[PDB]
Design a binder for this molecule. Structure first.
Ligand SMILES: *[C@@H]1O[C@H](CO)[C@@H](O)[C@H](O)[C@H]1NC(C)=O
Ligand SMILES: *[C@@H]1O[C@H](CO)[C@@H](O)[C@H](O)[C@H]1NC(C)=O
Lengths: 125, 50
């Protein structure tokens, strides 16, 4: 059985920074890349970032580029996402997703087989 | 008596004879392949009768 649990979401005022992580269990964590995906309330999901299986390489979406930073810890089986100068348009239910094992044709196809639970992040005053 | 030039007969027709076959050669199966191989384990394919 493979399952992922994340925590660290909460209400903050604009202009602060957050730190949330999900701890994997049930599979060899070091052998799989990981993605972060967010879903605004009422709309479809949206891709955020991605980290490699050793942490030496990564990529991010342009919308959150320069404000979102991710990191990995193979030994502790935890992966982190850091938001800096967070803004009002970052309210969603963030999930940490696992990269697809097999994809058949081509090498650029990606999909998420197993998802997390979700942490609600909202901003107001 | 002097020697001036040379005499040579010119050809009149053209003859071409190729083995007539219609098996169009399988190049797409190699150029369009989804996954190639690693350089250290390259893949060889023979081609004949095309
Ligand atoms: C060429 O054509 C002739 C007559 O159509 C046939 O007998 C012969 O087998 C053909 N050659 C090849 C290689 O198929
Ligand atoms: C491979 O696919 C292209 C796509 O149209 C096609 O034009 C071509 O004839 C195929 N074969 C080779 C050898 O490129």
């Amino acid at each position: 059985e493979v399952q992922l649990v994340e925590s660290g979401g909460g209400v903050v005022q604009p202009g602060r920074s957050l730190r949330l992580s999900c701890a994997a269990s049930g599979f060899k964590f070091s052998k799989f890349a990981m993605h972060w995906v967010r879903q605004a309330p009422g709309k479809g999901p949206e891709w955020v970032a991605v980290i490699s299986y050793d942490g030496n390489q990564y990529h991010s979406a342009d919308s959150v580029k320069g404000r979102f930073t991710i990191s990995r810890d193979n030994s502790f089986n935890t992966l982190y996402l850091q938001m800096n100068s967070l803004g009002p348009e970052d309210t969603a239910v963030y999930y940490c997703a696992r990269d697809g094992p097999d994809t058949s044709g081509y090498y650029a196809n990606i999909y998420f087989d197993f998802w997390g639970q979700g942490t609600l992040v909202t901003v107001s005053s | 008596i002097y020697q001036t030039s040379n005499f040579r007969v010119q050809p009149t027709e053209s003859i071409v004879r190729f083995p007539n076959i219609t098996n169009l050669c399988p190049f797409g199966e190699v150029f369009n392949a989804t996954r190639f191989a690693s350089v250290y384990a390259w893949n060889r394919k023979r081609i004949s009768n095309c």
